[PDB]
Design a protein around this ligand. Structure first.
Ligand code: HEC
Ligand code: HEC
Ligand code: HEC
Ligand code: HEC
Ligand code: HEC
Ligand code: HEC
Lengths: 291, 291
């Protein structure tokens, strides 16, 4: 899109990208398509967290355990698919979803703490209430799994995205795709290897001893980690590469994430290239006109 | 909202809905929020199927079996996340994702059959190529599972959404949520029933003999059916109730699904009430003056 004046501003900047590899251009294109939403979500989560802390809500609302008040996981369950009612509740405009009069009288005055918040702040806070418990739980489980993986020495033979003495965690995740129950049974010593020969089988078999005595919850977290960490590590590495290119080449001078300046925001670019990442890459190579 | 002239047109029509239950109003609200997209998707899929059939593509492309050409399932895998490229290929603008030069020369002239299609028709055709194999496979598995359920007599004690001699399929689906592996093990006779008292357990235990002789694939289809059919039947029942209300009360005289007439399209209404279904229900019962 755009007219000739804007075209002439951006066209020279494509020279900054000469000599980038196809992998770097893919990483950069991914970053352009996805960073504005990630930045906006982080900014709103930070606003919500600051309100939640400042108003004292955590005194009675822990993420995944009940105290004087219900956990945020339980609140999220009560308002599943009903975020607009959660916002109305926080404004004092809807009754409690359940409970009796004693609990109602505990929570009712605390709604005073939210008077004078803007609609955008209430929206961010409602988003946070609906989502933070699952995010906290997933981080707790991943930390448990990472600690087991390190303490038992699995990484010596299992890197995230490269083969060594053993297969990469990416290859393991491929072998167990949609078969997490079988991965847990394998880690318990209850199923044979998915493939390979006897030599590889003999290397890995004694290492299963390192997992005896783990609880079912620990094995579940470890299995989740094995299935998911390679892609998470690869995405982080690619985003770091892209961010470094974006900074080094000066693109941020005209492209903020969610505000227009000399150039369009990255959110507006992402909308222009929605479902057309192949075209974004070709544009970055100087091979396609402005949208 | 809308103004005085428009509000005066619609306001009397809410009298049509006096006498509806809360459940009927919920079904009607769901229908208003979802029917325009459902109808649009059905129209697009019908257009794509007609093109695929009339241009002869099926002669070499079966849904889930290779013949002269790759199966639609294989094409869908190759173009996963690359729909824009699929459309460009169908337009004659991109070479083949692989294969030898001989197979490339077989397919290349067939693209002239797509000359004259609109961008919208090509998008519908690409959608169809990406989705139809999975859709056909799911329908085949559900038909197999329904036939087993009916021929083995399970419905004598298991209705979809009401308890009889045995629990409803909705209650079974709740008990096995996220535990389909355990449901398959149970159907095989390998896990003694969780616990409804020894009397209830002894009613169901002999019926597991009905399933001896099923393949693993048939048991998986049956387990899928048990987990999903109650919600599917409930949604169909609610949609049928809502469609009948919408037709009998005359709402379609002014509300078409995807085009504006005297009143806004159902697509516009759905966008206005996105995430605000509770406000839509209150509007329909006349308990909430109009925007
Ligand atoms: C100010 C001097 C800019 C710098 C530095 C960079 N860009 Fe830019 N960009 C700028 C303008 C004024 C526009 C709009 C141009 C138009 O003709 O409308 C753009 C546009 C883009 C786009 C979108 C292209 C499209 O087809 O819509 C992209 C993907 C883009 N710019 C990327 C980009 C990168 C990676 C940069 C650093 C190498 C960069 N821009 C620098 C202004 C400026
Ligand atoms: C202890 C003194 C509390 C503090 C401080 C806050 N809340 Fe609370 N909350 C508390 C109780 C005992 C309950 C249950 C109330 C009931 O009637 O059952 C709640 C409930 C909530 C809910 C759920 C509302 C629903 O309809 O289910 C929410 C969304 C909620 N509380 C939010 C909230 C916020 C944002 C707070 C800081 C301003 C806060 N609470 C403080 C107890 C206590
Ligand atoms: C090198 C001495 C290893 C260490 C330390 C660990 N593993 Fe391993 N692993 C290794 C090999 C050579 C193989 C291939 C085995 C084969 O027979 O082909 C594996 C395989 C796995 C798998 C895949 C199992 C499958 O069925 O495909 C998993 C899930 C696995 N290994 C996990 C794992 C864990 C959790 C470890 C720390 C306790 C661990 N491995 C250590 C080599 C080595
Ligand atoms: C047999 C005479 C064919 C008919 C009729 C159609 N197609 Fe085909 N198709 C055929 C072959 C042998 C191949 C593989 C070619 C190769 O180079 O490997 C294909 C491939 C496709 C693809 C995949 C393209 C890709 O880049 O992977 C698509 C999307 C496709 N064919 C679509 C298609 C349509 C829409 C047809 C009717 C107009 C059609 N094909 C007819 C063989 C034959
Ligand atoms: C009446 C004579 C029944 C027929 C015919 C079938 N089932 Fe049944 N089923 C029945 C009862 C009374 C119960 C509850 C038993 C209890 O211990 O509480 C059940 C239970 C099931 C379940 C749930 C298993 C669980 O662990 O919760 C399933 C999945 C089930 N039944 C499936 C099923 C199928 C597939 C049948 C046809 C082969 C079938 N049942 C027949 C009573 C009766
Ligand atoms: C023509 C005489 C109509 C008939 C019959 C029905 N509706 Fe209607 N509707 C009509 C107009 C002109 C408008 C716009 C009103 C405005 O203020 O701009 C509407 C609006 C609606 C809406 C949206 C309300 C909102 O707040 O946006 C809904 C949900 C709606 N109408 C539903 C509806 C139903 C269920 C009807 C049959 C009982 C029905 N309408 C009849 C015009 C006409």
């Amino acid at each position: 899109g755009g007219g000739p004046a804007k075209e002439a501003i951006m066209k020279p900047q494509l020279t900054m990208l000469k000599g980038l590899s196809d992998a770097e251009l893919k990483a950069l294109a991914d970053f352009i398509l996805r960073i504005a939403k990630q930045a906006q979500e982080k900014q709103q989560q930070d606003v919500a967290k600051a309100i939640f802390q400042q108003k004292g809500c955590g005194s009675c609302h822990q993420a995944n355990v009940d105290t004087v008040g219900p956990s945020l996981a339980k609140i999220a369950q009560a308002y599943a698919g009903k975020e607009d009612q959660l916002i109305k509740f926080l404004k004092g405009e809807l009754p409690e979803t359940g409970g009796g009069p004693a609990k109602e009288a505990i929570m009712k005055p605390q709604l005073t703490m939210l008077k004078g918040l803007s609609d955008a702040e209430l929206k961010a806070l409602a988003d946070f209430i609906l989502r933070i418990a699952k995010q906290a739980q997933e981080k707790q489980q991943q930390d448990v799994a990472k600690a087991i993986f390190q303490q038992k020495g699995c990484g010596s033979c299992h890197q995230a995205n490269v083969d060594t003495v053993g297969p990469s965690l990416a290859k393991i995740a491929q072998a167990y795709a949609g078969k997490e129950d079988q991965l847990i049974k394998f880690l318990k010593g209850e199923l044979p290897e998915t493939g390979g020969g006897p030599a590889k089988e003999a290397i890995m078999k004694p290492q299963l001893t390192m997992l005896k005595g783990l609880s079912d919850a620990e094995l579940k977290a470890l299995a989740d980690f094995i299935l998911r960490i390679a892609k998470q590590a690869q995405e982080k590495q690619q985003q770091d590469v892209a961010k470094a290119i974006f900074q080094q080449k000066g693109c941020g001078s005209c492209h903020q994430a969610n505000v227009d300046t000399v150039g369009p925001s990255l959110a507006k670019i992402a909308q222009a290239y929605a479902g057309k990442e192949d075209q974004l890459i070709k544009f970055l190579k100087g091979e396609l006109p402005e949208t």
